[PDB]
Amino acid sequence: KERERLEEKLEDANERIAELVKLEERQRIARDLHDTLGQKLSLIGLKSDLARKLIYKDPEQAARELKSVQQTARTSLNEVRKIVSSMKGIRLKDELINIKQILEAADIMFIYEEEKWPENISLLNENILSMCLKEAVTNVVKHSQAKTCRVDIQQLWKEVVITVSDDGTFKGEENSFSHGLLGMRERLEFANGSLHIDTENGTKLTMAIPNN
Amino acid sequence: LEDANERIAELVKLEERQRIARDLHDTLGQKLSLIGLKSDLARKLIYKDPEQAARELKSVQQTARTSLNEVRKIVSSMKGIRLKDELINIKQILEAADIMFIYEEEKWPENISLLNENILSMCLKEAVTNVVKHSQAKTCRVDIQQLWKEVVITVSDDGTFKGEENSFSKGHGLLGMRERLEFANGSLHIDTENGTKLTMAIPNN
Numbered sequence A: 001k002e003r004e005r006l007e008e009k010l011e012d013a014n015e016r017i018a019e020l021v022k023l024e025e026r027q028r029i030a031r032d033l034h035d036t037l038g039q040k041l042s043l044i045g046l047k048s049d050l051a052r053k054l055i056y057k058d059p060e061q062a063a064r065e066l067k068s069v070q071q072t073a074r075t076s077l078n079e080v081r082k083i084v085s086s087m088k089g090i091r092l093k094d095e096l097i098n099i100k101q102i103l104e105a106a107d108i109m110f111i112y113e114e115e116k117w118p119e120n121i122s123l124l125n126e127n128i129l130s131m132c133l134k135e136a137v138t139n140v141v142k143h144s145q146a147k148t149c150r151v152d153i154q155q156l157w158k159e160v161v162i163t164v165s166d167d168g169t170f171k172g173e174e175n176s177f178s179h180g181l182l183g184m185r186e187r188l189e190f191a192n193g194s195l196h197i198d199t200e201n202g203t204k205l206t207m208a209i210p211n212n
Numbered sequence B: 001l002e003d004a005n006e007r008i009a010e011l012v013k014l015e016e017r018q019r020i021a022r023d024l025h026d027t028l029g030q031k032l033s034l035i036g037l038k039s040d041l042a043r044k045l046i047y048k049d050p051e052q053a054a055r056e057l058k059s060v061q062q063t064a065r066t067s068l069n070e071v072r073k074i075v076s077s078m079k080g081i082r083l084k085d086e087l088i089n090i091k092q093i094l095e096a097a098d099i100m101f102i103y104e105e106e107k108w109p110e111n112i113s114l115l116n117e118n119i120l121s122m123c124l125k126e127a128v129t130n131v132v133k134h135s136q137a138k139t140c141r142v143d144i145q146q147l148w149k150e151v152v153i154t155v156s157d158d159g160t161f162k163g164e165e166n167s168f169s170k171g172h173g174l175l176g177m178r179e180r181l182e183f184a185n186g187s188l189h190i191d192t193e194n195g196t197k198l199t200m201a202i203p204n205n
Ligand SMILES: Nc1ncnc2c1ncn2[C@@H]1O[C@H](COP(=O)(O)OP(=O)(O)CP(=O)(O)O)[C@@H](O)[C@H]1O
Pocket: A135, A136, A138, A139, A140, A141, A142, A143, A144, A145, A166, A168, A169, A170, A171, A172, A173, A176, A177, A178, A179, A180, A181, A182, A203
């Protein structure tokens, strides 16, 4: 009714700030890129050209020039190797490993068995999920003081679900949502999924997100 | 707001930043590897077949020039870039001059014409040079504010103004500076009271 009309409106303004902030982003990069890969790539222009001119007039210098070109091609693509490494993102496969290591070295038993694991989930969600995960684990090896920790990750419905439970005690007060907690929620929620918790026996984190 | 705000910020930031890396690799990858290949192949045929070699290098120049342009168009549109470069340029010159550079980004510019940005850059650089030329001051305050419609640099130095009473000789950056701001319908003023003080103004647009 009235509530539907005013949600449509609320979505329109969200999106509007979206496009704007994404733009400002396109930019930080515009400066870095231009600097580096721009001087270099203009130089590639010039040596290309100059090489073509000297092919006959002087095939020696021509060659030497092409040597320098290939050099700068390669290293430039190397710069973007160093660049799409960033925000390329971690895949859970990797985050699970990381955490198995952190839990072992925490003095804690890591309970797992690969259960109905994920396919054709957006790479992005994979990053977020990776994050919340790492944070949850840290919280546990920070306060729970549990000695064992169960975890499963399943493709339920059209929605993916991690669950991370620890036998320790939840050291938090009644409203310590002050911190990777508010962080976690804020996140999943923005991805239109959910985060839930139970301090019944130790601490239990259910993260959910849309997949299929 | 402290965090709902700039947390959802930094998250759409990362949303599209992953998208942006997939586009780098996609576009400039394919392209730049192809540049590798044609470079190489060109070197091989320089003699065996200098014709094909040339043709290959033509296609190379095309691509190298082309890749920069997509990024470049965004850069031309973007504002505040000229001033930032100038600040970096002058901070360096002042440091290396033996001089303290006083600054704090104060109500800095948005949607000023790119042109005015260049002019202002200029007068600025010239002002600085004059200081590190004659003022022999040891510290130098500078601010750049968006005052109402009009933008204003102010560049002050504690040294002494070595100039005579009417040192505004043409072809010197003084007559040059005025000539300029004034042609842009803004203004230039100075005070030799304590050291030297330059107020540049111009229209924001
Ligand atoms: N798995 C767990 N076991 C026991 N206590 C936990 C827990 N997860 C969170 N807590 C408690 O809840 C409170 C809030 O945690 P939150 O995640 O906001 O910050 P933190 O203490 O984990 C450090 P950071 O915010 O840097 O990760 C903490 O005071 C912590 O002791």
